[PDB]
Amino acid sequence: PDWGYDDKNGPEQWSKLYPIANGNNQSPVDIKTSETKHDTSLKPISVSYNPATAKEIINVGHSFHVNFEDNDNRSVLKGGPFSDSYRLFQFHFHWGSTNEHGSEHTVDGVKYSAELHVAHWNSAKYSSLAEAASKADGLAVIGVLMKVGEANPKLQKVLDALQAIKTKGKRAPFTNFDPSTLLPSSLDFWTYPGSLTHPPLYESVTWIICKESISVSSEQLAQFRSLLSNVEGDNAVPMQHNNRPTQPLKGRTVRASF
Ligand SMILES: NS(=O)(=O)c1ccc(CCC(=O)O)cc1
Ligand SMILES: [Zn+2]
Numbered sequence: 001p002d003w004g005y006d007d008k009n010g011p012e013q014w015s016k017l018y019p020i021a022n023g024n025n026q027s028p029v030d031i032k033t034s035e036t037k038h039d040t041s042l043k044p045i046s047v048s049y050n051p052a053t054a055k056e057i058i059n060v061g062h063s064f065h066v067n068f069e070d071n072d073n074r075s076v077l078k079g080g081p082f083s084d085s086y087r088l089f090q091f092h093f094h095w096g097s098t099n100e101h102g103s104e105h106t107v108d109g110v111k112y113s114a115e116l117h118v119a120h121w122n123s124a125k126y127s128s129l130a131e132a133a134s135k136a137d138g139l140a141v142i143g144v145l146m147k148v149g150e151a152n153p154k155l156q157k158v159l160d161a162l163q164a165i166k167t168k169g170k171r172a173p174f175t176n177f178d179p180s181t182l183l184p185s186s187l188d189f190w191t192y193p194g195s196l197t198h199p200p201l202y203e204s205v206t207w208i209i210c211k212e213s214i215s216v217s218s219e220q221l222a223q224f225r226s227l228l229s230n231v232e233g234d235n236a237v238p239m240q241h242n243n244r245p246t247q248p249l250k251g252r253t254v255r256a257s258f
Pocket of ligand 1: 117119141195196197198205
């Protein structure tokens with residue numbers, strides 16, 4: 001790939017190959033609570049996922065993805081700022097080199113250890129992820145900040161699956177899992193129009209950032225960093241980090257559901 005998180009192909013250099021990197025709707029961003037607008041037209045977030053839609057876990061070199069079958073509405077996101085139903089298709093994480101950083105979004109300048117992203121595409125208006133991916137209202141991603149602390153038992157199935165996809169390109173069946181079990185108890189959120197946090201960086205994401213964080217232990221984070229970005233047989237290259245720095249709001253307004 002022509003992009004990554006290293007010095008030469010990293011976030012700071014993405015604009016060379018992907019000009020949109022310097023766009024007006026880029027993510028992640030720093031959420032300044034003193035500037036958020038408490039909107040009353042925002043309904044509660046509603047998620048209903050079918051564990052049978054879980055399909056496969058894949059090492060994609062810079063991270064790993066857990067994909068879901070998206071041929072129907074068995075797993076969907078509704079409510080919040082949406083009028084359309086969004087179909088679940090994947091969830092993944094972002095982490096940093098050390099516990100000091102790792103999340104992509106930040107709140108009042110505070111950086112967390114990792115971040116969970118649960119992605120969905122607008123099946124009410126579009127026919128596929130491919131079509132929806134580049135549409136302004138095509139994607140909806142829930143972001144959950146992960147604060148280093150007690151080990152999180154709900155991450156167990158995901159963590160135990162990593163040993164089967166250690167190197168780039170490896171993939172394995174990952175079934176019977178409901179990602180709503182990874183979300184915090186409260187679904188109060190912030191929302192703003194943004195983009196994918198890595199190439200192609202399409203500004204097609206309506207973000208849903210949870211106010212409440214979830215926990216993750218230092219050892220669990222070590223497991224993410226123990227994944228390898230190289231292909232089997234080559235010198236091991238640990239996946240140390242994959243979080244993009246926060247970008248300028250460019251006048252966008254972050255709304256709060258609380
Ligand atoms: N980081 S993020 O903005 O939550 C995000 C969500 C979905 C994809 C689609 C990724 C793919 O299919 O390779 C990429 C990035
Ligand atoms: Zn992400």
